[PDB]
Amino acid sequence: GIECDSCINPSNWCDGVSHCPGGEDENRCVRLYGPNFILQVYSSQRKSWHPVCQDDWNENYGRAACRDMGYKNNFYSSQGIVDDSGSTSFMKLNTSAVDIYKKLYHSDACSSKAVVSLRCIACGVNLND
Amino acid sequence: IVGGESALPGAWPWQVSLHVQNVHVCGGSIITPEWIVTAAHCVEKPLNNPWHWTAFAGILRQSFMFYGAGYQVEKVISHPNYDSKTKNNDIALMKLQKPLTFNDLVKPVCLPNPGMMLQPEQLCWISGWGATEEKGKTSEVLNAAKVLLIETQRCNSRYVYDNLITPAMICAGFLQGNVDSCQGDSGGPLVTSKNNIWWLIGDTSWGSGCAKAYRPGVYGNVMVFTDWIYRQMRADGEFV
Ligand SMILES: *C(=O)c1ccc(NC(=N)N)cc1
Ligand SMILES: [Ca+2]
């Protein structure tokens, strides 16, 4: 069970339906992982985070993932990269579809062989390098 | 900052000076054009109201923060689990009335992601206008210094901080001292470079004295706070 500053059943965490009075179970379902900003989504069935495949991903999907993460209208970059998060399962996009995390399905591979690297804001750059 | 050096323009473009009554009080870190990460103890009552606060960006010298260069703060949000006694969960957010304009002098620092795989003694940087000596005055020029991460197990030793470092805290500095944050640096950034990107890993929170041996700096563990930060930012985006 996961608590939302009250715990909820795990299959109802990030299942598209709010169950916590404040909605904490449905508002932290997208996340950037590692120093390469690998886009990850929480799978309620597997109770784990999984990278998003580059297959059929576009800018407007990234912008919506950036909106879900709290970056509003901020968008910097999105490209496919080789997964370095050591994952074995992935979330592949179904086009026949709806919130970002409710549009994906479990896949053990990605056709493109790439995962989404998403940057919502141009940060972390100073004078050097 | 004790033991540091004066910062160059654009060296720390996310650093802001937070003012109350025309006087620097705390540091903060830009993460978006609207949002600043600072420390919750900076905004304890009576300074919890946003109208007291002005933020100055892209200016290195306190005497150069003229009337009209500041950005008026619109919202102050302390972490709901902040504890004044222990400084646990010492983080707060500040939203500006008008968004910053980003350029070579004013840019955000990146929020940390899970899976950064930092080294146990990762090389880090701190910056601010805090005193350059314990019990000293606010510094006129922005300073910065290199500090190493100190593993919490070592920091919680009987001879360092004796189990006072909670999972919402990290230690950085040198057990010999001589390089440390100090009064007026609190709320400011603890950043590290990885994958050619600067990440905000800590916000300057507290410590016993400044630059004293076996009393390093304690920083709010920004990684633990990212979920709360995202929720606040998304909730504000949906208007209030
Ligand atoms: C904040 O103003 C602040 C943070 C930390 C210290 N002490 C040490 N870093 N030892 C003083 C003041
Ligand atoms: Ca739910």
* Domain range summary for chain B, segments of one domain joined by +: 1-12+109-224, 13-108+225-240
| Resolution of the experimental structure, in angstroms | 2.4
Q: Kindly write down the DSSP assignment for every residue of chain A, as one continuous string.
A: -B-----B-GGGTTSSS--STT-TTTS--EEEETTTTEEEEEETTTTEEEEBBSTT--HHHHHHHHHHTT-TT---EEEEE---S--S-EEEEPS----GGGGEEEES--TTS-EEEEESS--S--S--
- At B163, phi and psi to the nearest 5? 70, 15
Q: Give B23's contacts (C-beta < 8 A, 6+ positions apart).
A: B138
Q: Give the integer Cα–Cα distance in Å for B111 and B37.
A: 10
**Bridge partners of residue A79, in order along the sequence:** A117
Helix H or strand E encompassing B55: strand B54-57
- Is residue A76 within 8 Å of A65, Cβ to Cβ? no
Q: Which atom of ligand 1 is nearest to the CA of B215?
A: 10
Which of B148, B204, B212, B214 most suits a substitution to test ligand 1, by most atoms within 8 Å of the C-beta? B204
On chain A, the residues whose CB falls within 8 A of the CB of B107 are 122-123, 125-126
Closest approach of A94 to chain B, Cα-based (Å): 25
Indicate if B79 belongs to the active site. Answer: no
Closest to B79 in 3D by CA, of B67, B93, B66, B97 = B93
- Is residue B9 within 8 Å of B149, Cβ to Cβ? no
- Please give the C-alpha separations between residue B195 and each of A34, A124, B146, B199, in angstroms, as whole numbers: 10, 10, 18, 10
Closest approach of B237 to chain A, Cα-based (Å): 6
Query: Which residue in B17, B29, B139, B186 is the catalytic one?
Result: B186
**Bridge partners of residue A48, in order along the sequence:** A43
Helix H or strand E encompassing B23: strand B23-30
Helix H or strand E encompassing B203: strand B197-206
Read off the amino acid at residue B65: M
- Please give the C-alpha separations between residue B26 and each of A19, B38, B98, B103, B206, in angstroms, as whole numbers: 39, 8, 20, 23, 12
Q: What is the DSSP letter of B26?
A: E
Closest to B93 in 3D by CA, of B53, B57, B126, B59 = B53
Task: Judge: B199–A67 Cβ closer than 8 Å, yes or no.
Answer: no
For residues B36-68, b (16+ Cβ closer than 10 Å) or e, as one string? bbbbbbbbeeebeebebbbbbbbbbebeebeee
- Hunting for tokens 């920091």 — which residue is that? B155
- At B153, phi and psi to the nearest 5? -60, -45
Paired tokens of A76: 């910097």
* C-alpha radius of gyration, chain A, whole number: 15
Helix H or strand E encompassing B57: strand B54-57
A56 assigned ligand-binding residue: no
3-state SS assignment for residue B5: strand
Domain A29-119: assigned CATH number: 3.10.250.10
Using CA atoms of A122, A123, A126, B1 in order, give the dihedral in degrees to the nearest 10: 160
Q: Give the integer Cα–Cα distance in Å for A35 and B42.
A: 30
The answer to whether B227 contacts chain A (CB < 8 Å) is: yes
* C-alpha radius of gyration, chain B, whole number: 16
Paired tokens of A16: 């598209």
Q: Give A117's contacts (C-beta < 8 A, 6+ positions apart).
A: A36, A37, A38, A39, A77, A78, A79, A80, A81
Residue B40 CA: which ligand is closest?
A: 1
Task: Judge: B32–A32 Cβ closer than 8 Å, yes or no.
Answer: no
On chain B, the residues whose CB falls within 8 A of the CB of A27 are 231, 234
Read off the amino acid at residue B50: P
Closest to B112 in 3D by CA, of B19, B190, B205 = B190
How would you classify residue B229: left for phi > 0, otherwise alpha for psi between -120 and 50, otherwise beta?
alpha
Task: Judge: B197–A123 Cβ closer than 8 Å, yes or no.
Answer: yes
Q: Whose CA is nearest to atom 9 of ligand 1?
A: B217
Closest to B46 in 3D by CA, of B76, B82, B18 = B76
Q: Give B89's contacts (C-beta < 8 A, 6+ positions apart).
A: B40, B79, B81, B82, B83, B168, B220, B225
Sign of CA dihedral B47, B48, B50, B51: negative
Q: Give the integer Cα–Cα distance in Å for A73 and B113.
A: 20
Cis-peptide, bond into residue B46, ω within 30° of zero:
yes
In angstroms, what is the span from residue B227 Cα to ligand 1's centroid?
Answer: 25
> What approach was used to elucidate this structure?
X-ray
Q: Which atom of ligand 1 is nearest to the CA of B39?
A: 1
